């Protein structure tokens, strides 16, 4: 089978600047009738892949002319003349010349923006959940940049590393930020035994953690 190798793996580009991505095939993609079945696709967060380029160098149907496909033989390039935030996502190449048809591994375009500290909010377990025997404490770390961030939980001032599950959103094209949710799950009995719950966010934007806490049984 034809291997489709894309580079770079990821790119970070400021809005209004150009982007260029490479796709190199292990076999020539020219066919016996002079067509080259090389397509470029964009997969935006939470969507299916969508057409961009086909026949190696042709704009596919309805695609903005900011996208340009070039190359021939085994070596192809996608250029975006000026990046827009809604351009973020994963770009793939695909070949249709050699059975079985194969896709490249994807290149993720990130939008570079100014640093932004997270907005941090902490939530006690609901009364509803407390009737069931488990207790989840949730902390949201929202709309920050860049994407790396650390969360630390404390119970009664002592770090708790057990029972924490984190989840991260994809980059938002509306503001080019990231968000993260962190959930500390305890038994109801263990929750009802302690008093203070704390989530601390550490982000490159400050050497000082952002701390949010509450006391069980206080509003």
């Amino acid at each position: 089978d034809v291997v489709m190798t894309q580079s770079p793996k990821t790119i970070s580009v400021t809005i209004g600047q150009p982007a260029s991505i490479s796709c190199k095939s292990s076999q020539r993609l020219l066919n016996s009738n002079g067509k080259t079945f090389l397509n470029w696709l964009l997969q935006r967060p939470g969507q299916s892949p969508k057409r961009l380029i086909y026949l190696g160098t042709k704009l596919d149907s309805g695609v903005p002319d900011r996208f340009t496909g070039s190359g021939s033989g085994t070596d192809f390039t996608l250029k975006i003349s000026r990046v827009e935030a809604e351009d973020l996502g994963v770009y793939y190449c695909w070949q249709g010349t050699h059975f079985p048809y194969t896709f490249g591994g994807g290149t993720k375009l990130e939008i570079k923006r100014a640093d932004a500290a997270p907005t941090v909010s902490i939530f006690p377990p609901s009364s509803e959940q407390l009737t069931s025997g488990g207790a989840s404490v949730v902390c949201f770390l929202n709309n920050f940049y860049p994407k790396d961030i650390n969360v630390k939980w404390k119970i009664d001032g002592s770090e708790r590393q057990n029972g924490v599950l984190n989840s991260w959103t994809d980059q938002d094209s509306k503001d080019s930020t990231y968000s993260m949710s962190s959930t500390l799950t305890l038994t109801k009995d263990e929750y009802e035994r302690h008093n203070s719950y704390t989530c601390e966010a550490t982000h490159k934007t400050s050497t000082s953690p952002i701390v949010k806490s509450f006391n069980r049984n206080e509003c």
Binding site: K50, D60, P125, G134, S179, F214
Partner: protein
């Protein structure tokens, strides 16, 4: 123009078969296109599975060796996927996608359907309101949330105020542990608006035919 839509069971037991349907609108399946099945695994990995074309000719990836059948019903303008002997390694998002036979153009994909191959039981979620602590309600904005816990399989849908509240929302990817998912969503509004304008998280879990509409009540008197 042409539009494609996948349908079919979202949870399949190991060693059984996955069966999906693609319904095509806006175009006859007996004209111009190759009608493909493509699946996506984690880490941006896409695999071409096969096609049936406008004349009924088929082709499929040798990676699927004898497990796959691609068929059609022209009276229904539908084409189909059957994949037998499934294992957990077949868990993926399945897409149908039409590309023109002549040139690979006009690529049109369905929304995709997740198929989970698992012996685990379908379980309805519990939907918990996340009301802000009093201390975090005295500023210009306030953040509320919803925790959808203990369900299987994916997916759920979650909206706020029936979809009328869409800005300021972050719905996070679910986390799987012990064959149950948990997902959370946050919503941020101008603080003086709450609790005068109520906020409700609407959760649906099609696999268990369950819907929950949870109003977020303030901590403290209600």
């Amino acid at each position: 123009r042409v539009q494609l839509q996948q349908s079919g069971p979202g949870l399949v037991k190991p060693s059984q078969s996955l069966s999906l349907t693609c319904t095509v609108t806006g175009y006859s399946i007996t004209s111009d296109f190759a009608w493909n099945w493509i699946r996506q695994f984690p880490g941006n990995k896409l695999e071409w599975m096969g096609y049936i074309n406008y004349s009924g000719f088929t082709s499929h990836n040798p990676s699927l060796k004898s497990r796959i059948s691609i068929t059609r019903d022209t009276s229904k303008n539908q084409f189909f996927l059957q994949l037998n002997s499934v294992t957990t390694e077949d868990t993926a998002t399945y897409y149908c996608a039409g590309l023109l036979w002549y040139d690979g153009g006009a690529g049109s994909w369905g929304q995709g359907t997740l198929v989970t191959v698992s012996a685990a039981k379908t379980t309805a979620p519990s939907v918990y309101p996340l009301a802000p602590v009093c201390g975090d309600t005295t500023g210009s904005s306030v953040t509320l949330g919803c925790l959808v816990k203990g369900y299987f399989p994916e997916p759920v849908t979650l909206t706020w105020n029936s979809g009328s509240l869409s800005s300021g929302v972050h719905t996070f990817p679910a986390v799987l542990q012990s064959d149950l998912y948990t997902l959370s969503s946050s919503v941020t509004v101008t603080s003086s608006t709450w609790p005068s304008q109520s906020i409700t998280c609407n959760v649906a879990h099609p696999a268990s035919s369950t819907k929950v509409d949870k109003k977020i009540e303030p901590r403290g008197p209600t």
